[PDB]
Amino acid sequence: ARSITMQQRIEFGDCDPAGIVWYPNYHRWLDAASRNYFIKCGLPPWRQTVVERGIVGTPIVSCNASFVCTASYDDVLTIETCIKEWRRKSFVQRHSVSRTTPGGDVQLVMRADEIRVFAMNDGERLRAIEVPADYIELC
Amino acid sequence: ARSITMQQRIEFGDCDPAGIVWYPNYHRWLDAASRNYFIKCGLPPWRQTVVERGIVGTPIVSCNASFVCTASYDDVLTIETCIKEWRRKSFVQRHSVSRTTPGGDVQLVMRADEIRVFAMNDGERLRAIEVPADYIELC
Amino acid sequence: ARSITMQQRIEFGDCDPAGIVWYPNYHRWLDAASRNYFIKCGLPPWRQTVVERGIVGTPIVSCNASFVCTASYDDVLTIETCIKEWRRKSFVQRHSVSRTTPGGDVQLVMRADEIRVFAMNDGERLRAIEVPADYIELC
Amino acid sequence: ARSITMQQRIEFGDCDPAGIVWYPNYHRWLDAASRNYFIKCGLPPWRQTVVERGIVGTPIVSCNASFVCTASYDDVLTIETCIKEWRRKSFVQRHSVSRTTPGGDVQLVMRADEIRVFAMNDGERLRAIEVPADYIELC
Structure with a gap:
């Protein structure tokens, strides 16, 4: 499993007065998507890991996103995630988000590359x- | 200091397609207001407390809210918070929220009573x- | 259909530093649950309604909630919603939330009664x- | 006014179980920061504009962010925003976020470039x- 799929329904509250998904929400879903990828790959919850290895998770260091189409309530998103590249102490997580409107329309909604790292609590702050x-x- | 005041500006993203503050957001602000009350009263951050006393904060056990008027972006809210009643291992936190529209209109927006408790990590779960x-x- | 069930997975971001679901999040899910109830009952999306009838949705007027147990990431919640009582221009929406921990534990997490109303845009503000x-x- | 400053306090709920600001929250604040820039520049609220000109706001088309340092509750962020470049029907919004810890420490927390556009409702969807x-x- 290198490419993992996740669905997410858009709710009314997830939209702004303009009637479209409020942007910051997409980051919420990609965060979930990221995490969902390792779990679906076999990794243990951060809960165990944090005691077993002392890994608190995978904080984000950088990211690049492009939004090409709008989305609104009732629409369902399909999130595709895979690991694009492995570096030494960091990896490139790729997400392609597609929107399926009522009436089965399907358009690519967004694409994003998230650069993350495995991290642990190093005294004061987190360390990669x-x-x-x-x-x-596993991945 | 028994009655503490806090301001909060409403942003565009804090509103739904209907153009008014999306409800769940008010809970976010009352949470902040609650916390802001103890700090303004003299309590130390949960950060210290959690090591000093082992108090993780004040989880909510119950709450009752009434919304009387709408609110939207650009409007500023004034939050008034005080401790209504002290029980044995819990207290009653009262919040009165007022909205100030552009053009200086002032209406009561919401009222809420939050029943909370001081808590600590008790092995598996939290304990009051x-x-x-x-x-x-202090309070 | 009077009693409607909805599932919701808890994500990492939905929790506070204390490691448990941050309260305001439950309101987000009940909002979704509320809306999900009418749709599952047969009502048309607010999108249509808003043009067809001019109904913008069902704003909340009051609510009472009790939290009895904690919840955390990875846990799945089961939301049960029904209409408790119909009044003249408002109704009582009842939600019972149960948590299923890893290892299949099942505890009631929260109960809440939301008093809502059908509303429309009345010039300046919303009207019931x-x-x-x-x-x-339908319901 | 080309460079606009905005402050934002970090609350407890804005952090994850790991004890640091949950990422998606930064997008919430930059969204506010963006909007705050035009208003502080002289633009009229989207409310007026939407009727006056029919401009619904400035949706995001792309963005690039780098996080260099962590942040947590109680810390205050300083957001600096300016328009980096004007294109034909889009502009480059630059944000530099700095964190001020208790004890007056000051570190750059994040940098982000947001490519946005002025938009209007074009029948079905939004148009730039x-x-x-x-x-x-004005800007």
């Missing part, structure tokens, strides 16, 4: 670490 | 505790 | 209306 | 328009 080998294996 | 005497003193 | 007879029929 | 000349004037 080399991606564990069982994680690269 | 008797309100510390220096907290009753 | 008598619940349409085809809505009472 | 040439940036009005009084807006370029």
